Amino acid sequence: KHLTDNILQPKRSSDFMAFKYEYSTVDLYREFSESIMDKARSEVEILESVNRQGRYKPNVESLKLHEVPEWFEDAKLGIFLDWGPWSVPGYAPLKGAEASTGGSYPDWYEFLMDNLYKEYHDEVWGADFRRDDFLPLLTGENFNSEEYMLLAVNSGAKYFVPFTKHHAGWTMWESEFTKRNAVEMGPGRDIYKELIEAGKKYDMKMGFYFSVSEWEYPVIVDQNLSQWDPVKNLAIFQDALGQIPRATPLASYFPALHDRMISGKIPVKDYFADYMIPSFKEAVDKYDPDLVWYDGGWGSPVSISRTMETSAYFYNQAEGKKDVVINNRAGSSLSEDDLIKVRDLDEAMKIYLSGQQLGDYGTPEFTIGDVDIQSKWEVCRSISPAFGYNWQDDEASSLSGEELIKLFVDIVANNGNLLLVISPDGSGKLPDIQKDRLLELGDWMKVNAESIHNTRPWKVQKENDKFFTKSKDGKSLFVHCTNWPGENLIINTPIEEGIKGIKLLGSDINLQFTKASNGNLEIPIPKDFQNNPSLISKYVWTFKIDLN
Amino acid sequence: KHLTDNILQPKRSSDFMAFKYEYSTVDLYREFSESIMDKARSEVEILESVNRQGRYKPNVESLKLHEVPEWFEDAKLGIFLDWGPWSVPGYAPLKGAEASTGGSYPDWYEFLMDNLYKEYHDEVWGADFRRDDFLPLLTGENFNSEEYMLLAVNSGAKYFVPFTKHHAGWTMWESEFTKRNAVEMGPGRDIYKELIEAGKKYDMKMGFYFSVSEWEYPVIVDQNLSQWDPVKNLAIFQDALGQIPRATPLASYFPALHDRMISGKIPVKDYFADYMIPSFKEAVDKYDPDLVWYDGGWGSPVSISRTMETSAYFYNQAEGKKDVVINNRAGSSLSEDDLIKVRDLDEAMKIYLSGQQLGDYGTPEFTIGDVDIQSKWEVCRSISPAFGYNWQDDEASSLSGEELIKLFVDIVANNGNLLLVISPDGSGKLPDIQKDRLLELGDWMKVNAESIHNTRPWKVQKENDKFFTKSKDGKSLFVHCTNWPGENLIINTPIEEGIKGIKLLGSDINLQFTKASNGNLEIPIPKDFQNNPSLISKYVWTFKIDLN
Ligand SMILES: OC[C@@H]1O[C@H](O)[C@@H](O)[C@H](O)[C@H]1O
Ligand SMILES: OC[C@@H]1O[C@H](O)[C@@H](O)[C@H](O)[C@H]1O
């Protein structure tokens, strides 16, 4: 049904033995909780003092004054490295398990293996194979951080966002606040450090992806939750992150159920104050990222998660040092009363959107939808529906290079950035098909990058098969033709300014042009270009019009 | 840790294969839901019409006027047959997993196998072995209903209460409202019908044990609960029954998780109206029980569960036909406001008890506690802490026959009934240790039953090692000596009435007496009784004093 004999399908090893980390959850409680909470209190005091003295305060109106940096307007393309324990099984259904975004989520395997993907998991991995048994298999033996950064550079990308910490809480960086980190578990390396160092060497802006909430977190409680609870003073914190109905805010903690899904996480009293805030601060302080990509901010509203404090801190510590940016996923600004009204209730969506007030730019996922092209936005997606590696993904399931380039041009014409997801396997190897699409995009950008990087939308974004961008200064208009226009390029959209010159990017030759009497621009195409226009540029041909 | 090589420990068979019931939950939705809801609506209408026309109305004040039947005052001993799918694994910890009652619960295994007992389950049965894989192993090959009824008769019991439907919803009777029944799953017989027929044959009062709520139940919903839900219009209803925090009222339904926990259950729109009420009515109508033993009434308050309607119906359908009784487990009469106050908040216990207003008699579980001996009460317990079969139970864990008989006499002198739990294994065989205790109790009752059945508390319940009962007609006082009194029985407690005669039950000798000057009754005991009084009666010696 789900178990194939296809070599490409990751599956249970014949030598599988349970991963029992050196420290049980109770061991971490006894040995590390007090120490961590002590350290957290000191770090939170420092962060709060920085915010009290700093330009940015933890409130919507203060943070709103922060502006999108020039570099982020100009970047247009980022690489989103979706790699983590979920990369080992590398599975979602090719069809039929799409979320409301239209994507599919191999990167939700650690959660969905217990419900939506349980039949697959039980047949391919085994019911006795727990979430944390994927951690030792995340070897990174084929993961080369410099090669990933160079691939991103060569693709034309201007920022690189690793999945530094996703919903199950494994950190790509060596954290003092969790043993569920890349040094203790999986590759045995500070993967984030390697990527940060590579990004500095290649002059690449670096992101920090950070799940605000986690699916489960062991917490210290005064009173137990039921007569069945086996362990005094420990429970499991759960919020809305999982999306499915669950016990909230606390579930009863049972070692035989929970320990092998939360290996390495040190119990604390207050998930947000004692763990989330100090771990965020730690990564910002150590790695100095250019960009914060919150995720999982729907778990708890910001009145509880305190992400306005992490946002203010990030901006404050950047002052005078570098220009930085935050996405719009910190969480909701709504009051308890407004959150209740939404749950009770089109009318629910209007109230919800009113509470989405934090961040520098919008983050449509997979489907672009009805974007406001007057504000900055970024669409995230891979070359397929899949966020995270899908061993089944292939030529049939993935965009062609041609489709990817045309989609990219569309995005950029409409004021968007593309944050292009790449998804390695458990070894850290990138599938050849994803490598190929990056190479093809890179080859196209070699010719056409000046019509993409550092541009802005024009008064018109699309005309038939043409997409427009303009130089920052207004003096160059770029016409991206998604069909080879043949003998003649005709542009119907009025161009008020006089024209100094027109050229096809990829040719050093200046093109002929005249204005017809109906208003159209007519651009004859050299006979020598017709024989094989793909030699100049594949898929999309860009004409630069220099204005007076 | 948990898997022994003890043959007595039930464990995974080498020939185990998954039980995938011929009707999936979705099959039952498509094929049976409409039919069941059609029948339910008609049955609820009939039940409501009976209550409108009947003497008892579904409100606290009306139901309170119903009185404990003479037969229940007189019975003193019932047998509580704790048999179900949980009987197969037959496990709870010998120590350390007691609930707040002081008992332990092998009969919660179907629920606790996923949390508290998960380490045991994984080691002994396997992670791939689901709750419903116990159902085919509940063979009943050693279960003879006539033999169980005769065991009850011969023990001195006057009522027999089978676990007709416990918290996972397997019915001992052949129900039209569920395929999770004893005919379609497990023994392939209407076990309840067999027991009811035996009870009629042997003139035994018959109970109907009924879990109001169930741990999980598939329900039909207009809107799905999450973007992850695989099946339109089905979800899982959950209330407070499970005691541990859970999603309530609804969890997302996932076939690969839920189907092998809820085999046989037919989805309905309203758990209470479309399933609970008509299934209750069905069993009452078909089997004509003398007693309703509600359980699991803490799931939902009676405003939602509607158990005042089932209680009124039970009384109304019996009126003019037979005298019947209900325990006190229908559920809470508290308002939503009062239930909220209890959750917020010793103070919580006072409010909770104020909302416990339904039923004919109290049901202390395991621990008797501070019972009101002016009202009728019944303590339920097995010979050990274990409710349900525990394969580990032995001489060290169980009451001796001696202890059982003395506890029983204590209960009866204090106006209680003992509802003695007996716990068979998966085959339906009763463990030898429980058989031994029942033999001792039965042998004791053969001699002493007239001092137990049809008696009432006396003006004094206990004098040193002596417990008193009196015949309901006042003409006999029974003195139960828990120590052999030796050469003389001396009774300090004044007996105002003249004495016609005195006898030790088990002997035909009339005993002489004198009243001393201090007031004491002095009863010389025959020399021939002194060497071996245990021949006459074991453990407790009962003297019958006939009064004027
Ligand atoms: O594009 C980022 C995606 O964002 C979602 O919010 C997460 O829940 C997914 O796992 C991640 O892949
Ligand atoms: O006295 C009956 C016991 O009553 C409890 O309420 C149930 O939850 C137990 O399973 C059962 O053994």
Ligand code: NA
């Ligand atoms: Na702003």
Ligand code: NA
């Ligand atoms: Na009453």
